[PDB]
Chain A
Amino acid sequence: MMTGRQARAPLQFLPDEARSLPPPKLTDPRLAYIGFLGYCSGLIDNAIRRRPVLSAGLHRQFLYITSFVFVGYYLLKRQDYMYAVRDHDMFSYIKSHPEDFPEKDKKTYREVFEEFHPVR
């Protein structure tokens, strides 16, 4: 849908204007969930090779957690960037086309007549 937006600057994971946006905190619940996925990957890696699941390879489990947090941080940054680009294009388009977005007359319910349907 937005393929013409990211075509003037192709193959940029995070563009320069992405730095205008606030990055996710390191205590992001999504980033904590991806770290939990790293912990689950470490436990499954010890379970498939018949290792003590909590004991064997604390260095390996720690690299699983670290690698998934590291990849997921940049994935969350790009995610927040692309939703901000979506909203920026939306708001610029509504501002540039006022005739396609008229201000509606908000009527209170003293004028608004709804048909009543009795439940009996």
Chain B
Amino acid sequence: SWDKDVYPEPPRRTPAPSPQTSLPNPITYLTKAFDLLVDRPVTLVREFIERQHAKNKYYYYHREFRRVPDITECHEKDVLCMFEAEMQWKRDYKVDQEIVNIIQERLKACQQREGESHRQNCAKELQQFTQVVKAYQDRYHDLGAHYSARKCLAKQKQRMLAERKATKEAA
């Protein structure tokens, strides 16, 4: 499984079967045939494989990267510090990419799960999507193919000068 908080799902409200007709639908018979002939042998083979997994347990780990000094507190043309700042920035850029991917998966799952009432019932995921796309655009857009922490810091300083001038001219 996964984590239900990073991939949110509302609980399933399925309606009860209330058949009015006297003709039996084939879906019940084919579901019973799929349960007997397919799901049980697949479950048996999976339990065999699961026992063979349990006969030797061993683990893999999620690699933690501790924080190193970023590009703002690295000296100019000091490659030993700004190299590590650049590697940290590139890993953060790839992780922010996958954050945008997670919010896109939330948006698409909400749209398909809500069906025709998607335009009302997925305003929250749309708001989260617009927020994270606006943040990713102000953080990483238009840096070019030779992007760096220097390019991103220069874009941030230009945006902060623009915000400061817009605040100053309106006060």
Contacts and interface: CB of A to CB of B under 8 A. Distances in A.
Interface in B128-171: 142-145, 150-151, 153-155, 157-158
A100 B71 CA distance: 31
B75 A108 contact: yes
Given A109-B150, A115-B154, A120 B142 contact: yes
Contacts of B78: 106
A116 B151 contact: yes
Contact of A116 (B71, B72, B76, B158): B158
A116 B74 contact: no
A119 interface: yes
4 closest A-B pairs by beta carbon, nearest first, are A119-B144, A118-B142, A116-B154, A110-B72
A108 B77 CA distance: 9
Interface in A50-108: 106-108
Given A118-B155, A119-B144, 13 more contacts: A106-B77, A108-B75, A108-B76, A109-B73, A109-B82, A113-B157, A114-B154, A114-B157, A115-B154, A116-B151, A116-B157, A118-B143, A118-B144
Contacts of B153: 109, 114
Interface secondary structure of B, over-half rule: helix
A114 B82 CA distance: 16
A118 B144 CA distance: 7
B144 A109 contact: no
Contact of A109 (B71, B143, B155, B158): B71
A112 B158 CA distance: 12
A116 B158 CA distance: 7
A66 to B, nearest CB: 44
A119 B145 contact: yes
A113 B77 CA distance: 14
A105 to B, nearest CB: 10
B115 to A, nearest CB: 38
Contacts of A108: 72-76
16 contacts: A108-B72, A109-B74, A113-B157, A114-B150, A114-B153, A114-B154, A114-B157, A115-B158, A116-B157, A116-B158, A118-B143, A118-B144, A118-B155, A119-B143, A119-B145, A120-B142
